[model samples]
Target: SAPVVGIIMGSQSDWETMRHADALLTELEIPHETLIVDAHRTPDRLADYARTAAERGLNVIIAGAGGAAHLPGMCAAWTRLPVLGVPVESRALKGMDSLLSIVQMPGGVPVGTLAIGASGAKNAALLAASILALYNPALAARLETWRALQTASVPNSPIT
Candidate 1:
């Protein structure tokens, strides 16, 4: 079944980082699917996916890509739905380039950009749910529960 959320990366190399989004979404029971859709290498497939996203019942699109990181911006252009971008760390600039590219879209084209690497991806998943929760009672309650769990897991003191 097609999940309400879609997670795609620029390449397999991004899996090591992008899986953070998958982990968080799974924990939140946010039903999501993943794919390796390279904007640079396979633009047509990305275009098709974004254009048909709404028909497929995908409410949100989360794209994690390194380097130029055009996937999220392009996806946003193709679909009216919100696009969340995770900027994976690149070998050269350590994700600064990817982060800038994903976060610096022009007006009228806003892609919710997350931090670089795993932490960013995880936050993206949480943010995605928060966005969807706007119209979903179940999801809103779930988000509250997740936040409480996070708070409960924290240690008051430093490791000692």
Candidate 2:
């Protein structure tokens, strides 16, 4: 089935980090799909995916890639829809490079970048729902419920 959200990564190895986005989207009941679309290795596929995302019924995109991460930016270039970027931690710079690369976009090209690793991936899904909720009341309600549960689950004090 066609999903509203599209989650893609630079490589299969990235599934370890990108799965957090998938899980959160699933938990939120947001219809989404995942893929391995590398900007560096498979530029043509990335171009086609981004160009056709909206026609394919995708409202948002979550792109997670480590190191000289160009997936999100490139995706942004090819599409007008909102794109959220997650910086998967790289072996050499521990994702600092990924963070810089993903966030430092030129004027007119925007990729809503998130924190590094799992937190970023999780937040990307939440942010995507928030964007979708603008036009979807049911999703807005579900998102509020999830937010309330998350808030209530927080501990008031540190463990004794």
Which candidate has the highest TM-score of all?
2
Cα-lDDT of candidate 2? 0.95
Mind sharing the TM-score for model 2?
0.97
lDDT of 1: 0.92
Write candidate 1's Cα lDDT for 1-160 as tens digits: 4599999999989999989899888887888999999897899999999999989999999999989889999999999999999999999899999999999999999999999999999999999999889998998999999899889999999976
lDDT of each: 0.92, 0.95
Model 2 CA lDDT for position 83: 93
List the candidates' TM-scores in order: 0.95, 0.97
- lDDT by residue (tens digit), candidate 2, 10-67: 9988999999999999987889999999898799999999999999999999999999
Task: Count backbone overlaps in model 2.
Answer: 0
Give me the runs in candidate 1 sitting further than 4 Å from their true place: none
